[PDB]
Amino acid sequence: GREFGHLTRMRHVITYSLSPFEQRAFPHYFTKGIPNVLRRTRACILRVAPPFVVFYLVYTWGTQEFEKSKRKNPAAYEN
Amino acid sequence: RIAEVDASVVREVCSKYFYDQCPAVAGLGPIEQLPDYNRIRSGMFWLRF
């Protein structure tokens, strides 16, 4: 029963549209797009990135302590 | 002028003014079931002819 004439109630709202053949498919692309994708990067960088930094530090400590527990023996190797 | 109109003249003048043309649309509510402009524009060109 979810068809287009039966969805919700709406009053006093006007929309304006242009034909696709009357406009250019590529407007401002590097004038608007490059400043837009940079503040989107700034808005999410403090939430996503600090977990993946802690994975990097655990990975380096885990592969380096694996080798000098195994056959890397400078000075604890006496009688 | 009316007497020189026949069926092939009507087919020629209607194809010049209607066929692959962008229309202008106006609507006043309740118009939630008025189709999208892409579906209206694609209704101007036919499938089998």
UniProtKB/TrEMBL annotation, chain A:
Keywords: Electron transport, Membrane, Mitochondrion, Mitochondrion inner membrane, Respiratory chain, Transmembrane, Transmembrane helix, Transport. Component of the ubiquinol-cytochrome c oxidoreductase (cytochrome b-c1 complex, complex III, CIII), a multisubunit enzyme composed of 11 subunits. The complex is composed of 3 respiratory subunits cytochrome b, cytochrome c1 and Rieske protein UQCRFS1, 2 core protein subunits UQCRC1/QCR1 and UQCRC2/QCR2, and 6 low-molecular weight protein subunits UQCRH/QCR6, UQCRB/QCR7, UQCRQ/QCR8, UQCR10/QCR9, UQCR11/QCR10 and subunit 9, the cleavage product of Rieske protein UQCRFS1. GO terms for biological process: cerebellar Purkinje cell layer development; hippocampus development; hypothalamus development; midbrain development; mitochondrial electron transport, ubiquinol to cytochrome c; pons development; pyramidal neuron development; subthalamus development. This is Cytochrome b-c1 complex subunit 8. InterPro entries: Cyt_bc1_su8, Cyt_bc1_su8_sf. Pfam families: UcrQ (PF02939). Gene3D superfamilies: Cytochrome b-c1 complex subunit 8 (1.20.5.210). One of its GO terms (cellular component) is mitochondrial inner membrane. The chain crosses the membrane at residues 44-62. It comes from Sus scrofa (Pig). Belongs to the UQCRQ/QCR8 family. The keyword Membrane applies. Its main location: mitochondrion. Component of the ubiquinol-cytochrome c oxidoreductase, a multisubunit transmembrane complex that is part of the mitochondrial electron transport chain which drives oxidative phosphorylation. The complex plays an important role in the uptake of multiple carbon sources present in different host niches.
UniProtKB/TrEMBL annotation, chain B:
It comes from the Eukaryota. It is found in: Mitochondrion inner membrane. Belongs to the peptidase M16 family. UQCRC1/QCR1 subfamily. Component of the ubiquinol-cytochrome c oxidoreductase (cytochrome b-c1 complex, complex III, CIII), a multisubunit enzyme composed of 11 subunits. The complex is composed of 3 respiratory subunits cytochrome b, cytochrome c1 and Rieske protein UQCRFS1, 2 core protein subunits UQCRC1/QCR1 and UQCRC2/QCR2, and 6 low-molecular weight protein subunits UQCRH/QCR6, UQCRB/QCR7, UQCRQ/QCR8, UQCR10/QCR9, UQCR11/QCR10 and subunit 9, the cleavage product of Rieske protein UQCRFS1. This is Cytochrome b-c1 complex subunit 1, mitochondrial. It comes from Sus scrofa. The chain holds residues 432 to 480 of 480 of the full protein.
